[PDB]
Structures are given as structure tokens and as C-alpha cells.
């Protein structure tokens, strides 16, 4: 049972690494896209 | 970045200040970054 | 346990942080006083 | 003893950085107000000159005041440019100060964790006596 | 009537200068500072 406890803790840890990696990548892409959209809108409001 | 952009756009004089699509994009950017920040904090707590 | 350090690096890091903070506070003070001088001169000239 | 000495020095530096950041923010606001005042003076000079251009024929003359108004307009433009440059420099300095404050805070937190660990070991070693 | 159009031109020029100052800012830009209350930076405005 103790070996089972250690193995399960390791498995939960590596699952959390995987999930955190996808969350960080998604948030970075989303922030870059929103900043580009804002800059383009500012340029259009300049030209009008 | 978005906070400073809103503060600088707030200084428009007399009639020129307007409810713009740029204003809508900036507000959406601010709230979306806030949501991403909250999720990233809860992931930091789970990692600890 | 890959990452390990040594004793003098800790002291050097603390000394480096203190020195960097002191120099940037001094630079900020200099910039503040130069800006005040510029404001006074420009106001006098415009009036 | 060594670790608590380092912690005390870190706390002192953090306090000084905080007060310096606040004073620099105050000076930045004052510079912005002076920029707005210079802008109002420029508007006044421009409207005075263009209103005085409305003189009728023959009387429309290059008097002594026109050169003074043009020279004043050029001086005000130079003043506006210099004030904008100094405002940018002040904002750069304040951003650098904020980054160093954040680094000092993180190092303070690490030192506090290490103090907690060492005093926990000291509290653990009482059974051996 | 020319003076009325002059006032309109002055307002448009100042909106232009403020919008260029806003559009200069980028991601790794050191002139950007924090400004907390976007609700206070938002003000009642007229439509484009």
C-alpha cells in the first residue's frame, strides 16, 4: 500500500505539470492576440 | 499596458472623447487578462 | 537534487542586491531634482 | 544569526525603495500638470497671432510684436519637447525601481522561509537533551 | 464660421496627438506604468 501511495502521488504530480503547461501556453497566445487586435484598432482610429 | 492606454485616452479634450470600439477592446482585454491571472494564481497554489 | 551552491555566493548576492538598490535610488533622486529645475526654468520663461 | 542579519538589511532596503517610488510618482504628476499649462499657453499665443492677422489692407504691417509672438511660439514648442523627454526619462527610472522592488520582495520571502526551516529544526532538536 | 471650423480642427488635432501617444506603446515598453481604476478612467461620452 505504501508503494501504491508513492506511485499515485508521482502520477498526480506529472498530470498537474501537463495541465499547467497547456494553461500557460493558451494564456500566452490569447494575450498576444488581444494586444495585436488593440493596436490595429488604435491605428484605424488614428486614420479616421 | 492596457491600464496606461486607458489612462492616456481619458485625457481627450472637449467633444473628442467618445465611446469607441478601441474602448470596448481595451475593456475586454483588461477583464480577459484578469481572468487569466486568477486561473494562473490558483494553479500556483495547487503546485505549492 | 541537481542544483547546489556555495557559501560566498550567498553573501555576494545579498551585497549585489543592496548595492543595486542604492544606486538606482540615487539615480531616481537625481532625475527628480533635474525635472524640478527644468519645470521652474520653463515656467519663468513662459511668464 | 547570519540569516536574521541579512533579513533585517533586506527589510530596510525594501522600505526605502517604497518611499522613493511614492515620491517619484508625485513628481511625475507635477510634470504632467506643467505640460498641460504649457499647452494652454501655446493655445493662447496661437489664437492671439491669428486674431491679429485680421487687420485690413495697408495697415497690415510686420510690426515689432509679430516677431516676438513667433519667437515665443518656437520657445514654447522647444519647452514642450523638453518636458516630454524628461517625463519619459522619469517613467523609465520608476519602472526600473519597481522591478528592483519586486526582486527584493521575492528574496525577502525566500529568506523568511529559510528562517522558518532553521527555527523548526531548532524546535525539533529539544528531545535529544 | 471660419473660427468655428478652427475650434473643430483644434479638437481633432489634440485627439490625434493623444491617439499617437497611445499607439506608440508596446509590450516591452518602459514608459508604461500601473493605473488602477479603469471604472474611474471610463467617463460618460458622446457617440462617434
Swiss-Prot record, chain B:
Strongly expressed in spermatozoa. Also detected at low levels in pancreas. Expressed in airway epithelial cells. Ubiquitinated, leading to its degradation. Deubiquitinated by USP16, promoting its stability. It comes from the Eukaryota. It is found in: Cytoplasm, Cytoskeleton, Cilium axoneme; Cytoplasm, Cytoskeleton, Flagellum axoneme. Microtubule inner protein (MIP) part of the dynein-decorated doublet microtubules (DMTs) in cilia and flagellar axoneme. Forms filamentous polymers in the walls of ciliary and flagellar microtubules. Contributes to normal sperm motility. Belongs to the tektin family. Microtubule inner protein component of sperm flagellar doublet microtubules. This is Tektin-4. The gene is TEKT4. The chain holds residues 340 to 387 of 435 of the full protein.
Curated annotation (Swiss-Prot), chain D:
Transmembrane segments: none annotated. Signal peptide: none annotated. It is found in: Cytoplasm, Cytoskeleton, Cilium axoneme; Cytoplasm, Cytoskeleton, Flagellum axoneme; Cytoplasm, Cytoskeleton, Microtubule organizing center. Tyrosine phosphorylated. Ubiquitinated, leading to its degradation. Deubiquitinated by USP16, promoting its stability. Residues 1-113 form a coiled coil. Expressed at high levels in testis, trachea and fetal lung, and at lower levels in ovary, pituitary, adult lung, fetal brain and fetal kidney. Microtubule inner protein (MIP) part of the dynein-decorated doublet microtubules (DMTs) in cilia and flagellar axoneme. Plays a key role in the assembly or attachment of the inner dynein arm to microtubules in sperm flagella and tracheal cilia. Forms filamentous polymers in the walls of ciliary and flagellar microtubules. Belongs to the tektin family. Microtubule inner protein component of sperm flagellar doublet microtubules. May interact with CCDC172. This is Tektin-2. It comes from Homo sapiens. The chain holds residues 270 to 398 of 430 of the full protein.
